[PDB]
Symmetry: D3
Subunit: 117 residues, 6 copies
């Protein structure tokens, strides 16, 4: 995942960050304090960006050309996932964070299928 | 390109970094001093990574579903471009840097066409 | 622009980031939503910083003593441009982003003139 | 793990980076090409640093005074783990990478025990 | 402090960042303008994080087993110092910034004592 | 030094990093091991870059127009200092690191004079 290549990848990296994004949105609904809302927004932006980065790495470095042929929906799937993360950045609604997590789950399923193959 | 969204994008960001990658490769072919080789390798790695990031952003943020339907080869084209940048990191051969640049020029063309549409 | 040196520089990197800064200010004029305003501020801060960095690099790395002799106003000009960017971080008024872009255009002109010599 | 706090932590973040560190060391033993050795060194340095960062965060943010009381060896354990990572940065011997992984697994065990209580 | 190791460390790095944190909190009380409050919060967050990083480096890289033996309360002290910085991130009260600075000064004193022996 | 502005600045941030640069160069003069030479070069590059950044910040944010009028050679001085750091990046000779330190010490002096005015 470092581009050496090192041969070590795990969608878990993107997932843990996307999980913080949703967790942050949930906490934002429980505290309307201005300063807390600013910090939560700041931090959610950073964790969603990392989640996007991790997905980007899987897309560009892990997945090889044959994988996109074997899973015709893979390009679209990863693109929708990073876009859902962009949508979560601009929202305090936990559903947006959950949507990104749902796409990550599908990508994770494909990732492991390709690992065992 | 900042995900606000700000509406400002330009493949030139990716291109300028890819140009540095090739330029460093050319300089490496001309000076075999150990320390220069280390520094050149370290720096080429960073610039190639920034070029990958910029292309990733065009792919994840600028390009929308309509664009992928109009250019069915776009997903693969950007994926190949970033993969070419990974190969450039692993190489001192300027041709690898040029390969990345050729792909970037193709993405640049499509980018501007979508901007005029 | 990577300090190898690689021999590749372009005021365009500073310009593109400064354009995002102003573009963000324009979007802040239009929408008073708290979360949007927090996110716009956060991201504007990040892009203005990158723009200052790019200018600092032109100043520290690209421009040499003969350039400062030929253009005795260059130091002041670049210093005014980065200070204008600091002013843009602290403002939502596009006039501040515009002022930074104006100084950058002046720096860009001098840059290309030095590429002619 | 983002200091909001968000309530999401997983030692897996530290483990995955440490796994890359060891995997890179193994590749370095098998390929003596100069450029590969430089790239592997640069990248191992980066992943080891990320691993130390993740451990530092668990120590500073996740673990609380009651945890250090229940596990009097914990401060020492995390300190040894990060020092083991510093040692791996300075080494191409996979055994150093393995030692950091051994400590991370002991930290992971304690982490999950605090989740049961 | 760079993990080479280089043999150069100075608690002053943590202190200067902690001083910005407090200085920012002092300024937050004198201007309730929204944008200023957002920038102040955003920037305080960043400076506090850097201060935590500098303390983490002292703890992980500079201080060694003999030092922890001679100062049995050092682990707790550094851990309390970084937690104080986390508290300062979540507060506009300069008292929180002060508390972190006070812990840092204690660490600074111990640091110079270990340097004299 | 964070651009809020926070009112906290200290040339010591730049000095400490330049000190590491020189300390690393001294170590490189003594130890010829390839892997150590790679790590030292990699890390020296990073610390020299941070030193340049700290100097750039004093120049762009701390020093104001009246300071440049009061000390006309300040622009040149900071420019030479950052160029000396670029030179240190490209050399293993401690003398280059010392030269950067000498320029920083001249800047430190003017800095404190402006503080007392
Ligand atoms: Ni990897
Ligand atoms: Ni943008
Ligand atoms: Ni360059
Ligand atoms: Ni967190
Ligand atoms: Ni160091
Ligand atoms: Ni500041």
């Amino acid at each position: 995942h470092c581009d050496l290549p090192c041969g070590v990848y795990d969608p878990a990296q993107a997932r843990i960050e996307a999980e913080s994004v949703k967790a942050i949105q949930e906490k934002m609904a429980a505290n309307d304090d201005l300063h807390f809302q600013i910090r939560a927004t700041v931090i959610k932006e950073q964790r969603a960006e990392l989640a996007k980065h991790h997905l980007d790495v899987l897309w560009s470095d892990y997945f090889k050309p044959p994988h996109f042929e074997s899973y015709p929906e893979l390009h679209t799937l990863v693109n929708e996932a990073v876009k859902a993360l962009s949508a979560a950045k601009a929202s305090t609604d936990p559903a947006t964070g959950q949507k990104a997590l749902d796409y990550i789950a599908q990508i994770d399923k494909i990732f492991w299928e390709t690992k065992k193959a």
